[PDB]
Design a binder for this molecule. Structure first.
Ligand code: V0G
Lengths: 281, 65, 298
């Protein structure tokens, strides 16, 4: 259950500013360690560059998960993306390469969740030569313990998909004025992916994310379902909580709004810069 | 030194989830797939699924750090 | 690294459990190092890690720490004095009904905590119910425990030690609820009462035969829809010995509780929450305080 989960206690932060503080601290500490072991070197990377690179490689992780040869359940994909976000929230894209950590997060999400994939099959799901597959596999096993340690051994991740299904069940039963919430299901799947892309998972409970997805589908469907929260959620007698739920919904829809995909030239230059950083350690 | 039963009452920030037994004739089970005889032969009842769905739909709503 | 090893405590079938001490605090912990490729950290160690991190109950050990290296790890629980297997197999420790009430009460409290969080401890037996100097039980081995909410999963049908296997598990049930741990608790209760493993088997066939020859082959009405299970093999109508003849030193409340734990119907089998609401735990013999449980010396 989320309400006492380790994710809620530790891996859920107050505001986006805390995320930025932690990422900037990790990047700056890595820069200090690199300089002190050997400050403005044109090869070092700024936090926004790290953010764009992490966005691009999270898109890569989504692609790789969706084109997994055995059907990867959405729980494993969400768990892997959350592991990626958590790892790079407290670590830098320069110290550990995001492709290897992407694959390691996918592997540890396959293994922590009860998805059963044999490691040779997992690497055979990559686009490389068999010797390259073996190198990638040995890198993944080398980095798995590091990934687990940097997650502070909090391996359980609560996705918004189960609360999304629960909310649809509630809408089906207790909310009769709304009918056929399957269209809401499609548009909420779309919004839920688009919100997985941003940093909302570290700032909002999965239940809030699922409720926001379904109500955003209602809003974009021309369906006003504000009555659902007011009555049949007991919030009409709790005004502060209802106001806070509407505030959270608005803030996180706007958080979706102020997210732009990583560019093409910018990601290319950051990629080549990242390779130069990995070569000249 | 007698023992008296205490409900565990672990805090769940969110609306009160309907109780497992008081959940079949509230209409909830009409919208979760039926427990197939193989499923129902074991402890599974297709109401555990609905109850967990409802319990994680309200896990944390009225919570923000 | 920080933990200095004191003594070798045992060898679970997938890991080796040693005793150690920490420097930041003067106390004693138990390390559990996974045995030793090509497939990363052992998945049992990840069940322990991922699943003991989110539970905070007095009657469930929480792993204090975890460390490791390239492909092997070792978990750090608090060192925990003994387990019910030693106490049961001990002969000098007489278990008055108060002692067994305390043990069963603590087990059932821990199990209701676990089942509320939709975690099923699929391997429960007296060798896993540990208890420390203060005398509080904790469900130790979470090596093979899962979550029993999703209809989308598919459990393998042999994940519990055979003697403590619920019959619905023994017929190879893909989907099962909390009846697993409840039958395991019933078997633990019978073992505590008799100081002998209840229903000692050799295979699935033997375990079914002994279960039904001791409790009675179900009647398609006490456990309806048993025909639907995969491994449903029909045995002749065993009358089954009555319960009050086996647990002769047990009061009527205890017999009612044992009947509840042992219904062959998993769905009609009592759960940990409604097992603790029965009269047995509230009757005049109050469960002993942890300060007065028997200490299995040596
Ligand atoms: C007499 C005095 C005396 O009694 N000495 C003594 C005897 C026996 C023990 C003892 O029971 N130690 C012990 C055994 C088993 C387990 C544990 N603790 C523990 N803690 C955490 C964990 Cl995770 C585990 C565990 C989990 N899975 C496991 C499998 C196998 C083994 C352990 C295990 N266990 C402690 C202590 C003292 C003697 N002389 C003659 C005076």
């Amino acid at each position: 259950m989320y309400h006492n989960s380790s994710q809620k206690r530790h891996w859920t932060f107050s505001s986006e500013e805390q995320l930025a503080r932690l990422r900037a601290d990790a990047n700056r500490k890595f820069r200090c360690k690199a300089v002190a072991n050997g400050p403005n070197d044109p090869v070092f990377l700024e936090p926004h560059e790290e953010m764009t690179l992490c966005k691009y490689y999270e898109k890569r992780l989504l692609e790789f998960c969706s084109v997994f040869k055995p059907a990867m359940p959405r729980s494993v994909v969400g768990t892997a993306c959350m592991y990626f976000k958590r790892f790079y929230l407290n670590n830098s894209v320069m110290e550990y390469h995001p492709r290897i950590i992407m694959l390691t997060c996918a592997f540890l999400a396959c293994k922590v969740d009860e998805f059963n994939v044999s490691s040779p099959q997992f690497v055979g799901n990559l686009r490389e030569s068999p010797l390259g597959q073996e190198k990638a596999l040995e890198q993944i096993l080398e980095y798995e313990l590091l990934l687990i340690q940097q997650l502070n051994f909090h391996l359980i991740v609560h996705n918004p998909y189960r609360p999304f299904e629960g909310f649809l069940i509630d809408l089906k039963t207790r909310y009769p004025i709304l009918e056929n919430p399957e269209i809401l299901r499609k548009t909420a799947d779309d919004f839920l992916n688009r919100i997985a892309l941003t940093d909302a998972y570290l700032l909002y409970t999965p239940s809030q994310i699922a409720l926001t997805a379904i109500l955003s589908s209602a809003s974009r469907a021309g369906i006003t379902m504000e009555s659902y929260l007011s009555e049949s959620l007991m919030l009409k007698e709790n005004r502060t909580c209802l106001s806070q739920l509407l505030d959270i919904m608005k803030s996180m829809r706007n958080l979706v709004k102020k997210y732009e995909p990583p560019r093409s030239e910018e990601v290319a230059v950051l990629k080549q810069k990242l390779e130069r950083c990995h070569s000249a350690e | 030194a007698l023992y008296e039963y205490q409900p565990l009452q672990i805090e769940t920030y969110g609306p009160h989830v309907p109780e497992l037994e008081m959940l079949g004739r509230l209409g909830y089970l009409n919208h979760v797939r039926a427990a197939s005889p193989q499923d129902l032969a074991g402890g599974y009842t297709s109401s555990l699924a609905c109850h967990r769905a409802l319990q994680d739909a309200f896990s944390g709503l009225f919570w923000q750090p | 690294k920080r933990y200095e090893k004191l003594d070798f405590l045992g060898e679970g079938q997938f890991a080796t459990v040693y005793k150690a001490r920490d420097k930041n605090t003067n106390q004693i912990v138990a390390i559990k190092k996974i045995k030793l490729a090509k497939d990363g950290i052992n998945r049992t160690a990840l069940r322990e890690i991922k699943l003991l991190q989110e539970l905070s109950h007095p009657n469930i050990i929480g792993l204090l720490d975890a460390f490791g290296h390239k492909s092997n790890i070792s978990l750090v629980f608090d060192f925990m004095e003994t387990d019910l297997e030693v106490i049961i197999k001990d002969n000098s420790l007489v278990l008055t009904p108060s002692h067994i009430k305390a043990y069963m009460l603590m087990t059932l409290q821990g199990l209701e905590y676990l089942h509320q969080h939709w975690i099923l401890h699929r391997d429960l037996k007296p060798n896993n119910l540990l208890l420390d100097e203060n005398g509080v039980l904790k469900l130790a081995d979470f090596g093979l425990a899962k979550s029993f909410g999703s209809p989308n999963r598919a459990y393998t049908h042999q994940v519990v030690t055979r003697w403590y296997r619920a019959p619905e598990l023994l017929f190879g049930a893909r989907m099962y609820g909390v009846g697993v741990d409840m039958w395991a608790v019933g078997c633990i209760l019978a073992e505590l009462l008799l100081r002998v493993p209840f229903l000692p088997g050799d295979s699935d066939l033997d375990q079914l035969t002994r279960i039904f020859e001791t409790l009675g082959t179900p009647t398609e009405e006490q456990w309806p829809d048993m025909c639907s299970l995969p491994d449903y093999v029909t045995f002749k109508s065993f009358p089954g010995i009555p319960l009050h003849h086996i647990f002769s030193a047990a009061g009527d409340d205890l017999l009612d509780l044992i009947q509840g734990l042992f219904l062959f119907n998993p769905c009609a089998r009592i759960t940990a929450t409604q097992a603790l609401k029965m009269k047995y735990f509230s009757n005049r013999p109050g469960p002993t305080p942890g300060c007065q449980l028997p200490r299995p010396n040596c």
